[PDB]
Design an enzyme around this catalytic site. Structure first.
Site, PDB file in Angstrom:
ATOM      1  N   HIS A  86     -13.505 -21.555 -63.740  1.00  0.00           N
ATOM      2  CA  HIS A  86     -14.351 -21.923 -64.871  1.00  0.00           C
ATOM      3  C   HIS A  86     -13.516 -22.518 -66.003  1.00  0.00           C
ATOM      4  CE1 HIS A  86     -13.109 -18.230 -67.040  1.00  0.00           C
ATOM      5  NE2 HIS A  86     -13.577 -18.858 -68.105  1.00  0.00           N
TER       6      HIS A  86
ATOM      7  N   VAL B 181       2.765 -25.248 -83.468  1.00  0.00           N
ATOM      8  CA  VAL B 181       4.032 -25.733 -84.006  1.00  0.00           C
ATOM      9  C   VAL B 181       4.988 -25.990 -82.849  1.00  0.00           C
ATOM     10  CG1 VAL B 181       5.989 -25.249 -85.533  1.00  0.00           C
ATOM     11  CG2 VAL B 181       3.720 -24.397 -86.121  1.00  0.00           C
TER      12      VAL B 181
ATOM     13  N   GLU C  60       9.395 -25.766 -75.437  1.00  0.00           N
ATOM     14  CA  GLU C  60       8.169 -26.201 -74.773  1.00  0.00           C
ATOM     15  C   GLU C  60       8.382 -27.304 -73.742  1.00  0.00           C
ATOM     16  OE1 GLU C  60       8.518 -26.365 -78.137  1.00  0.00           O
ATOM     17  OE2 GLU C  60       7.057 -25.016 -79.058  1.00  0.00           O
TER      18      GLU C  60
ATOM     19  N   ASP D 279     -13.397 -16.871 -58.883  1.00  0.00           N
ATOM     20  CA  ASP D 279     -13.063 -17.603 -60.101  1.00  0.00           C
ATOM     21  C   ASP D 279     -11.558 -17.825 -60.216  1.00  0.00           C
ATOM     22  OD1 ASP D 279     -13.526 -18.965 -62.435  1.00  0.00           O
ATOM     23  OD2 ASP D 279     -13.806 -17.177 -63.675  1.00  0.00           O
TER      24      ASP D 279
ATOM     25  N   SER E  79      -9.830  -8.806 -73.612  1.00  0.00           N
ATOM     26  CA  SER E  79      -9.644 -10.243 -73.736  1.00  0.00           C
ATOM     27  C   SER E  79     -10.960 -10.847 -74.209  1.00  0.00           C
ATOM     28  CB  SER E  79      -9.191 -10.861 -72.412  1.00  0.00           C
ATOM     29  OG  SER E  79      -9.805 -10.218 -71.312  1.00  0.00           O
TER      30      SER E  79
ATOM     31  N   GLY F 271     -11.342 -17.772 -74.909  1.00  0.00           N
ATOM     32  CA  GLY F 271     -10.109 -18.485 -75.144  1.00  0.00           C
ATOM     33  C   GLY F 271      -8.976 -17.896 -74.339  1.00  0.00           C
TER      34      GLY F 271
ATOM     35  N   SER G 171      -9.390 -17.112 -71.201  1.00  0.00           N
ATOM     36  CA  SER G 171      -9.760 -17.426 -69.822  1.00  0.00           C
ATOM     37  C   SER G 171      -8.638 -18.086 -69.019  1.00  0.00           C
ATOM     38  CB  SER G 171     -10.992 -18.327 -69.811  1.00  0.00           C
ATOM     39  OG  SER G 171     -12.055 -17.750 -70.547  1.00  0.00           O
ATOM     40  N   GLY G 172      -8.490 -17.673 -67.763  1.00  0.00           N
ATOM     41  CA  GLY G 172      -7.459 -18.213 -66.892  1.00  0.00           C
ATOM     42  C   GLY G 172      -6.118 -17.511 -67.022  1.00  0.00           C
TER      43      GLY G 172
HETATM   44 CA   LIG Z   1       4.954 -24.507 -79.771  1.00  0.00          CA
END
Ligand SMILES: [Ca+2]
Ligand SMILES: [Ca+2]
Ligand SMILES: [Ca+2]
Ligand SMILES: [Ca+2]
Ligand SMILES: [Ca+2]
Ligand SMILES: [Ca+2]
Ligand SMILES: [Ca+2]
Ligand SMILES: [Ca+2]
Ligand SMILES: [Ca+2]
Ligand SMILES: [Ca+2]
Ligand SMILES: [Ca+2]
Ligand SMILES: [Ca+2]
Lengths: 223, 223
Positions: B40, B57, B62, B84, B172, B175, B177-178
């Protein structure tokens, strides 16, 4: 189930379908060899179909085990449908997996207002006759003994509860018989009778499984 | 995450952020090229952001890798959210370091009561609405199948278990999700659904990863 919703696939793994060529009644798996149903759902020779969602299409999770021993409660009256409880033994132990599982017997009786799950492949209509392919679910509360006695004056015995709505709209119906009423993890009710389906001040009456834990436990050891 | 704590920097190196113009869903890195999420959480355009702590930020750790393959489980129902689970292949292999790591698949299914870490950039409120910059963490236990079914009657299948609290307060939310539910080093759950967030007798429902290990290994090898 009238006024319920379609159960998710195998969300009710303890639900079995009593078969004799077609679907006629329901039941609940309490151990690998024992299905508990209703006494008025008795017939000589029953096929117990486990792991079902769509009773008219084969999906891959179905275990078809015929009954070897069908035991009716000795004190069952079919004028009042008192002691409407039945024990069915399988040929072989069913292979208990993630979608074919057992339901716990009640350690105590359930209070009024406690919430329960009623399920079945029974009628979804209140008028003529209409049957669903997929299992249906009904979230219904246990009503106080007082409300049950007043809804069916002189009819509701020791061994009965009412589970549902005085407004109507939501109820079990024809074909849901023998099926599970599970409250807080425990099988507290068996689909017995009622006056029609989803009628006002006419909730469904269910067999008190908590009165028969010793009888079942003794009978399972017995046979 | 409602009622959780702000995660330490890069303490959850397998946690990734699914991006499509802005954070919407989560995932877990299971090898250098494959992220496992929820079905989903599907979208045709996903950028997979790894090594994140503050998603608003740029910090220096990253890796921004666009999705190349979004594969949804074939038997996935988005009425019941059964099956799911979703597999995401990256364009390039991710550079595995101390701040971007893989999470192991379950070698066995998880018992009730075992403790797990749920993490996410999802909503931190059970009431109004609040979305965090920094990853949030939640230590929550695995609930019994009976408790999960008793919380969501006719809704919890094989491929679902509950992780959290019947008391409420911790869960949870939208947002999350997964995202990963990691227990004893292994990915046992994916953030799927629930009735609201952090409500009483309403814990979060998660995809049972232990039921899909073979499907994951095959899908990854195939593709
Ligand atoms: Ca960041
Ligand atoms: Ca079927
Ligand atoms: Ca009589
Ligand atoms: Ca149908
Ligand atoms: Ca959060
Ligand atoms: Ca942090
Ligand atoms: Ca692998
Ligand atoms: Ca490729
Ligand atoms: Ca699919
Ligand atoms: Ca690339
Ligand atoms: Ca792995
Ligand atoms: Ca539990």
């Amino acid at each position: 189930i009238v006024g319920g919703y379609t159960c998710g696939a195998n969300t009710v793994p303890y639900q079995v379908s009593l078969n004799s060529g077609y679907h006629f009644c329901g039941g609940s798996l309490i151990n690998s060899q024992w299905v508990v149903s209703a006494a008025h759902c008795y017939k000589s020779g029953i096929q117990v179909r486990l792991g079902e969602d769509n009773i008219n299409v084969v999906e891959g999770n179905e275990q078809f085990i015929s009954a070897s021993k069908s035991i009716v409660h000795p004190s069952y009256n079919s004028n009042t449908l008192n002691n409407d409880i039945m024990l069915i033994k399988l040929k072989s132990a069913a292979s208990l997996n993630s979608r074919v599982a057992s339901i716990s017997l009640p350690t105590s009786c359930a209070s009024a207002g406690t919430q329960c799950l009623i399920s079945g492949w029974g009628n979804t209509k209140s008028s003529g006759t209409s049957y669903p392919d997929v299992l249906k679910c009904l979230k219904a509360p246990i009503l106080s003994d007082s409300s049950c006695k007043s809804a069916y004056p002189g009819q509701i015995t020791s061994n009965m509860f009412c589970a549902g709505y005085l407004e109507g709209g939501k109820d079990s119906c024809q074909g849901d018989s023998g099926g599970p009423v599970v409250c807080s993890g425990k099988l507290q009710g068996i689909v017995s009778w009622g006056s029609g389906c989803a009628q006002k001040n006419k909730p469904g009456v269910y067999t008190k499984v908590c009165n028969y834990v010793s009888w079942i436990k003794q009978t399972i050891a017995s046979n």
